[PDB]
Amino acid sequence: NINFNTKHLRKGDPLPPFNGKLRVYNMRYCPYAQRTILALNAKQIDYEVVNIDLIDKPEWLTTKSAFAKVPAIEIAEDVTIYESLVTVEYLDEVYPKRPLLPQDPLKKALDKIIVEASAPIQSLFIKILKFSDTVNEEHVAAYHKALDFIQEQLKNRGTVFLDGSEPGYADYMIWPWFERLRAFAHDERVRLEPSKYSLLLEYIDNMLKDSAVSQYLIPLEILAKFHEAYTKKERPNYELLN
């Protein structure tokens, strides 16, 4: 029912009036904002998306998102939450069905640790994307430590997904970087050796089939095109899907 690909709004664009639907201030290619989409999808919460041009930001953005970042959710008129993990934790507390976070505090903590474990991945991706020349071997090594740790958590838990037979917070909150890893899979510093990472590669295949993931997937040729702008220092085209 939801259109993920309405125009990204720029300075001079009007602010659509609140209409009752929970609203996400998003940008289609933002992995951080993707966390909020995944959560909303998995929990089957009705919502609407307002896309934001991050190069030429709407004047009224900081009104909704103090740090001028995405995502932000608006849960009522002029009442907003931002910071991706903050938004997801709010939705999990207020919408009880399909709980993303473990109820047991210890298990909850482990999930958050796992998410933190993906920082080196988040880091390598943004470096390769925007500061590619500065990418050294500590970055690449840290990234591999990151993958090792995550795979091992999955191995130890023995389940299909980090959070069980259905993906949960840990899965969804790291997923966007795995979605992106797929498009970096022919840069040599990212490609995964299939013996070492066969369990992780299998998990990624299964994630692609989760309906919260699949309905929001970016076709890989589109994502590569998008990334291309950055590596050339071009002005982003936010409308490739529209």
Ligand X SMILES: N[C@@H](CCC(=O)N[C@@H](CS)C(=O)NCC(=O)O)C(=O)O
Site residues for ligand X per CB under 6 A: 30, 32, 54, 68-71, 83-85
Q: Which residue is associated with the tokens 């071009």?
A: 234
Which two three-digit tokens encode residue 240? Answer: 């490739």
Report the DSSP pairing between strands 22-26 and 72-76. antiparallel
Indicate which of K ion, ligand X, none lies near residue 13 (CB less than 5 to 8 Å, by partner kind).
none
Q: Which residues pair with 161 in a beta bridge?
A: 164
Indicate which of K ion, ligand X, none lies near residue 224 (CB less than 5 to 8 Å, by partner kind).
K ion
Site for K ion in 107-146 (CB under 5 A): 126
Site for K ion in 218-237 (CB under 5 A): 224, 228
Judged by beta carbon, residue 53 or residue 144, the one nearer ligand X is 53
Round to whole Å and give the CA distance between 46 and 212: 13
The answer to whether the annotation marks 213 as part of a ligand binding site is: no
Round to whole Å and give the CA distance between 107 and 109: 5
Judged by beta carbon, residue 26 or residue 151, the one nearer ligand X is 26
Judged by beta carbon, residue 131 or residue 199, the one nearer ligand X is 131
Report the nearest approach of K ion to the CB of residue 32 (Å).
7
| 3-state helix, strand and coil shares in percent for the chain, rounded to the nearest 5 | 50, 10, 40
The answer to whether the annotation marks 30 as part of a ligand binding site is: yes
Report the nearest approach of K ion to the CB of residue 159 (Å).
29
The answer to whether the annotation marks 94 as part of a ligand binding site is: no
Report the nearest approach of K ion to the CB of residue 165 (Å).
30
The sheet with strand 22-26 has its strands ordered as 47-51, 22-26, 72-76, 79-82
DSSP assignment of 145-210, as one string?
HHHHHHHHHHHHH-SSBTTBSS--HHHHHHHHHHHHHGGGTTSTTTPPPTTTTHHHHHHHHHHHTS
> Of the listed 9, 27, 30, 124, which one is catalytic?
30
Judged by beta carbon, residue 209 or residue 232, the one nearer K ion is 232
Judged by beta carbon, residue 99 or residue 236, the one nearer ligand X is 236
> Known catalytic residue: 30?
yes
Angle CA(127)–CA(129)–CA(133) in degrees, nearest 5? Answer: 60
Report the DSSP pairing between strands 72-76 and 47-51. unpaired
Report the nearest approach of K ion to the CB of residue 225 (Å).
6
Report the nearest approach of ligand X to the CB of residue 126 (Å).
9
Q: Which residue is associated with the tokens 């659509």?
A: 16
Q: Which residues are annotated as a binding site?
A: 30, 57, 70, 84
Q: Which residues are annotated as a binding site for glutathione?
A: 30, 57, 70, 84
**Residues acting as catalytic residues:** 30
Q: Which residues bind K ion (CB under 5 A)?
A: 126, 224, 228
